[PDB]
Design a protein around this ligand. Structure first.
Ligand SMILES: O=C(O)C[C@@](O)(CC(=O)NCCC[C@@H](NC(=O)C[C@@](O)(CC(=O)O)C(=O)O)C(=O)O)C(=O)O
Ligand SMILES: [Fe+3]
Length: 291
């Protein structure tokens, strides 16, 4: 019974050459398999089918939920009798021993990976499935599309951008080395959170993100903000108090109509080829709206 050796975040994994039925524990891995014409048999979808971005969700069709990404249901994983499990190298360290009793398990970056690392995980998945050629073709198409959208995005790249989610009193900002920050850099944007800026705000770190109160937002005063919220809504209680705040109203991005509220599932959680294409496409559209 022969195998393909690949490297994951824990070292070598021997993936059976007959691996066809695969459980995935992050959204990006579901996107990877859909791109390769493989339908996962189980997905940790948080009990929320709509968190799987629509084109991916529609290509995959029916699957079995294995619960939350934080705490996947190992009983449900075991019941599926998968050939292979694809787990997140940050979220799933604690369950790794248990997963490997169920099936060969790949531990790959998603949750703590940037844009290029999530691309690296896709390549590892393609190799593991004996679909290296198909993966190369798909990535060439992806890169061509991203570059086409880059060229179609009309925004002035000298307007520095702050990507963030809403938290506490202020914003929880994604710095320049995050998934979203790096993807914005790939599209030619300049992150307002430069290395020096982030260094001078580091006492505000909460894990990899920076907690910015309105005082610190005012000091940074980015020309442009991209605010990722559930359902791309702007009327949540947290966001409301922020939007009604006096320092908020004086911000350059606010005064000049350069704050865009975008979908958190697509922009922050998906981390796939389709979702990044959609994020770039959305920036094109936003840039072409009446000035
Ligand atoms: O989930 C992702 O893949 C990406 C990302 O974590 C990126 C991000 O910016 N996170 C900031 C979260 C701050 C927010 N917390 C939550 O909502 C919890 C959680 O994040 C948990 C999870 O993921 O285990 C959740 O999704 O339910 C709070 O307490 O204010 C995200 O959720 O956007
Ligand atoms: Fe999250």
């Amino acid at each position: 019974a022969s195998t393909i050796s690949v490297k994951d975040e824990n070292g070598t994994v021997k993936v059976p050459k007959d691996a066809k039925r695969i459980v995935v524990l992050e959204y990006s891995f579901a996107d990877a398999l859909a791109a390769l014409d493989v339908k996962p048999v189980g997905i940790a979808d948080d009990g929320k089918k709509k968190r799987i971005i629509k084109p991916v969700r529609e290509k995959i069709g029916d699957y079995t939920s294995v619960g939350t990404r934080k705490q996947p249901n190992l009983e449900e994983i075991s019941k599926l009798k998968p050939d292979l499990i694809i787990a997140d190298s940050s979220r799933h360290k604690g369950i790794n021993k248990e997963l490997n009793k169920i099936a060969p398990t790949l531990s790959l970056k998603s949750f703590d990976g940037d844009y290029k690392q999530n691309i690296n995980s896709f390549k590892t998945i393609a190799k593991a499935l004996n679909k290296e050629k198909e993966g190369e073709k798909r990535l060439a198409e992806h890169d061509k599309l991203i570059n086409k959208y880059k060229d179609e995005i009309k925004f002035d790249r000298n307007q520095k951008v702050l990507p963030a989610v809403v938290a506490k009193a202020g914003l929880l900002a994604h710095p320049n080395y995050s998934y979203v920050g790096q993807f914005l850099n790939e599209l030619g944007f300049k992150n307002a959170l430069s290395d020096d800026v982030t260094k001078g705000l580091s006492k505000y770190l909460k894990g990899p993100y920076l907690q910015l109160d309105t005082e610190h937002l005012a000091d940074l005063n980015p020309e442009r903000m991209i605010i990722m919220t559930d359902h791309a809504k702007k009327d949540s209680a947290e966001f409301k108090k922020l939007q009604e705040d006096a320092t908020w109203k004086k911000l350059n991005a606010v005064k000049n109509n350069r704050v865009d509220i975008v979908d958190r599932d697509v922009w922050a959680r998906s981390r796939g080829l389709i979702s990044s294409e959609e994020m770039a496409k959305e920036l094109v559209e936003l840039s072409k709206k009446e000035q």
